Subunit: 388 residues, 4 copies
């Protein structure tokens, strides 16, 4: 019913995730699971049918090299929301571990006045992100429908080019197919982007949790200043005990969200690299502003956009985590107590190796990663231009 | 009238910036703004007219591939002083925040003898840089005029090749156009290079401000040596309080000049990367020492020169900031007081992660950046040589 | 007879190494060496005969470019278990130094309860690794035999294509040659993979030895808490003396296993780089799922697999060594003694520069190395695709 | 006469440098300078004559592309010992500053027993390096003479192909030219390799000076152990005062040898990069083991060999400098005094950012640099192979 913590913070982000069809069966009533567990199986069956009918487009239209690569991208495009659809139930218990990692937070009595200032500050931006991302997908849902109706070639007028046992270019009952594909395209581009935001709202939680843990440092250090009674040294030790055990706890979250989502982040990034080395071939044969250009750009602005969504709040984690060392400096430690000065020396030794999300331990999700991926495309592109 | 700090330090660099036409409306009399605000609007109109007439050169001469790329560079060349012209009023309040960040500096009574030694040392080199850079642009203003008069092809004898509603190859009244383009070329290559120096004089201020903060460390540490009276421990704490709050304040500047100029540094560096992947195509078709070679080199020695201007004093920031850790070592801390020894342990923990100017958080402006950009050109060049 | 330490831990891994034919003459009875030293010489003679007969295949079939590169890889494939066969007796004394580095471990009286918990935990996973790797080679032994019998071209039906003074395509007594090559292929792919696991079990020993040294840190720090008697400060200093001298000792191991195996790791990695720039040429001419594709993939899944075997437990060393700094934090140091707090400040200064295995000081064996090698192949491949 | 320090250590390396013709006029009698200063001018005149006659070979044989690139390398090969010939007198005062940086070393009374153990240990290996390098050049002097006499083409039988106002293919008095070129080739390959060793013996001095400063750390820390009298705390502070002021002094050397030689190291490395992108073109047209192959390999094994000579003892500096942090750990600091424990915390904070030789602040001379240069050649080669 009620939720003991971080689950009560991502309540819009979880209902969408369960509503779109991720096999997320633990944050509502047990007297709703069995009608919902059947819903999740049939959506994946509706996913795997339509995605299965793209291969018979792809395999039968294998004689054209351009229609090979065109259908290759579209099948690799929708290869993300299949893997994330299946990554969630397979790597499942660690997801519930991360969502339940916050259900006993640390708290300090008179100085939680900055806890709730940044607690609800997270919940806005965690809900603000979901309203930005999933709304942009619904925009990109419309942005593939509107391009469908403004071009023809003879081809069947379809949202996604795929074979059917019935007809579409001659059967006028293909309005069933378009509403099927519109449902497919709105469920795929949400069920991928639902799970990505769940990762990307976790890091937004810990970033503002660190941003909380920045601003304690100046009122913490004024406690140890002045020749101190024992009630101060009891209070400043209980102030440190809050601060470190909060900071231990954020590390406990971020090493878990790198453990939960970390392997799927690789499979996401491994897919886009195969995707972008085909977009760059499609980006060669753009002879002008056409319907075709809005399909090459229409993927590349979105397939970079999935990478850019990670690499912002992956960077914002690293930018925030190193910034604690700068913020531990900008307190008046030079007239703190000696137990407070030895506190800062340790903190700046461990806010110095920043918290990064290891993408299955190959790469950290920095924005320099996105600078590397974007640079790798243009390098492969402007080589492939001169090799054309 | 008078200026409370850092604005009084960049007084040559600001008058040139207001004189050339940046919309900088806050460092002179209010009874001069309205004749000056009209001057700034009409210069941008004179910028946008001439730059607008280059597209009608570019779009109408689109059938030639070489004259495509030749006019592409020249339009991308002058795309810098349009963006910096508009970056300043848009991202405006942070510029005035950085220039007013110094108007209450920290000061220590008997040991400001090294403050003014490095205060006026900055003001020389900040004025020495402006006399070097803007003079080199005036040299490069002449260096595009002299090459104009030593070649012809039939073409209109113009400083910058562009269409006009009137004639130049047949109208002998095109001396109006050349004086218009000479004004255009002298205002563009200054209004870009004015704002770049403003960034690049900020870092020169903080570098010599750190170089000041190096040389305090040996006389600071002699205060804590020897068994100390309270008037020493009051004085050495007030010596530390000066040192850290100065060092907090330089960090407060450098995190602001990375916040003020940081996005435009990306747009500058994103433009030159598109520029240098066209210079390298022009660098292929150099069959000998000609007028043409002094146009390919005439851009590449300048377009690298804009990058090299950032990457020196970007590097000099990082070389200076890490050097505080070496200079905090080379004081006699081994016979300082214990509050002085715990001072050095903290300082070397935060002079260890050096202050770098993040170019909109993608890249730091190191000289290794300039080593990477220069290496990326020659790699693209000597691939494009073998692909020709 | 009995073994004083780490040799008694790798007892399956040593008997296989002596059994396969490495010149390892020091961990059994002296009344078994002389029948064993003759065995080691004749196996290398059986290695060098068969490998010598591949050059006369290679040199005589030099007119075909494809059969050049096909036999080039196979000779470069089996160039690993020749070099490792000869690396062991040449660089020999350092191997016995590393295996005898543990024969006087450090021990603390009441807190060795976590020593044997991680001592035998290593010995499982060190024996679990050998049962995985050498079993996978026996799988890959069968995986080159089964592909032999499912293809023909006229060619002699051979496991490895090589010339013989007698005949195989016409002499039906070539069953002697196949049993010779089956012995050759099972001894080569073990005598390389035996020595690799010896390196790769050392790092697994120190990783779980560090994982031991993680978990001391919370019970260590509870000793210094509370106003302490001298018997505590004697005990906490003897607790630190165990911890650092253990940590000095693991460093003493890892700087030795980077000194023992480090040069051969270069020669291994230098060989695969020459190998992978030929696999990528073979990976071009794959026109479909054939017998040929299972030879290109059959090497590339194994030649990357040798690199991937190092780069996991090379990474797991670096991931473990930096993790001590995180684990030295997550003890209650904020109410430890002052001698305990100054302990943590030093430890996090040297768990910060992680222990890495320098591959003859060029490269560290990270998993980012394997990310670089895998990225270098596909880059060379998908350039060579467009240059075909 | 006698020399006050480090000059008395490089006495073989200086006499060779003055003997070969570097304008080094300060380490012998004033009653020998004027006959020696004329010797230095005429050698450079003999250098600039022969090098000047290579351009008239190069410019007149410009119609052949292969003989362009062949003579281009040879002129770029001998472009090193011209620049280093002129780098020494131009950047001169800093060279004498580095050689006189050691003439007042720090010394501690009873614990200089490890000073002279590593003082004379340097002087061996500094003289051992000179006997290795300059002997290898004399080998490479012979290695270009022996290849001269084993090939002909009609061409004049010359050591280095160059024009003369007199004849060589028809004038049998060209034995004067060969003895001139043999003198030229033995003076060029020494006067470059003399100055390189001077840099590369400085780093060898500081490496063994750090290796000295490693081994003090265990006997230093036993002084502070145990409750200490004032004569101990006076002695341990005087032990620290020796250690840091030695370590400050090595930093004072290494920041000077990066300031003295640092710009010429760039010009050396900038030349070889232009050289290696021509060797790789020559490395393409090697059709077999010939006289020609021993000229392509005969430069590439030497032009990499100049880079490899820096990058070993550049790496050995960085490997040694970071190793102080490991060696400051492996003393018994856990029962040192508190002034000794706060010593180690500072040392490991500044042996953590290693001392590197900045090649005019672009690149550090690591062995990863040599790994990058060697990787850049083969990448450019095996691209240029597939583009042939």
């Amino acid at each position: 019913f009620k939720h003991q913590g971080l689950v009560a913070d991502l309540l819009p982000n979880i209902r969408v995730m369960q509503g779109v069809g991720h096999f997320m069966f633990n944050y509502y009533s047990e007297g709703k699971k069995f009608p919902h567990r059947i819903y999740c199986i049939v959506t994946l069956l509706l996913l795997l049918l339509q995605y299965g009918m793209m291969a018979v487009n792809l395999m039968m239209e294998s004689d054209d090299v351009d229609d090979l690569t065109a259908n290759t991208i579209t099948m690799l495009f929708f290869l993300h929301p299949i893997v994330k659809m299946i990554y969630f139930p397979v790597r499942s218990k660690i997801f519930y571990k991360t969502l339940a990692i916050w259900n006993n937070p640390n708290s300090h009595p008179l100085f939680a006045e900055s806890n709730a200032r940044f607690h609800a500050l997270a919940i806005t931006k965690m809900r603000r992100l979901l309203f930005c991302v999933a709304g942009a997908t619904i925009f990109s849902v419309i942005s593939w429908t509107g391009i469908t109706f403004i071009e023809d070639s003879p081809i069947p007028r379809l949202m996604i080019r795929t074979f059917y046992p019935f007809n579409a270019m001659s059967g006028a009952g293909h309005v069933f197919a378009l509403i099927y594909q519109f449902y497919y395209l709105v469920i795929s581009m949400a069920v991928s982007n639902s799970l990505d935001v769940l990762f990307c709202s976790w890091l937004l939680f810990a970033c503002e949790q660190l941003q909380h843990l920045k601003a304690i440092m100046k009122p913490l250090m004024e406690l140890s200043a002045t020749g101190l009674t024992k009630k101060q040294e009891m209070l400043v030790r209980s102030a440190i005990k809050y601060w470190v055990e909060r900071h231990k706890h954020v590390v406990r979250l971020v090493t878990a969200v790198g453990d939960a989502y970390g392997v799927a982040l690789l499979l996401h990034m491994l897919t886009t690299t195969i995707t972008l080395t085909l977009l760059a071939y499609q980006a060669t044969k753009v002879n002008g502003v056409n319907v075709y250009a809005a399909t090459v750009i229409g993927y590349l602005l979105y397939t970079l956009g999935q990478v850019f969504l990670f690499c912002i709040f992956g960077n914002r984690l690293i930018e925030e985590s190193s910034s604690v060392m700068e913020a531990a400096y900008s307190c008046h430690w030079y007239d703190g107590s000696e137990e407070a000065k030895t506190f800062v020396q340790i903190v700046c030794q461990q806010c110095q190796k920043a918290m990064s999300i290891s993408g299955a331990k190959f790469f950290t999700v920095s924005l320099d990663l996105f600078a590397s991926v974007l640079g790798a495309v243009v390098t492969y592109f402007m080589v492939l231009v001169q090799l054309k």
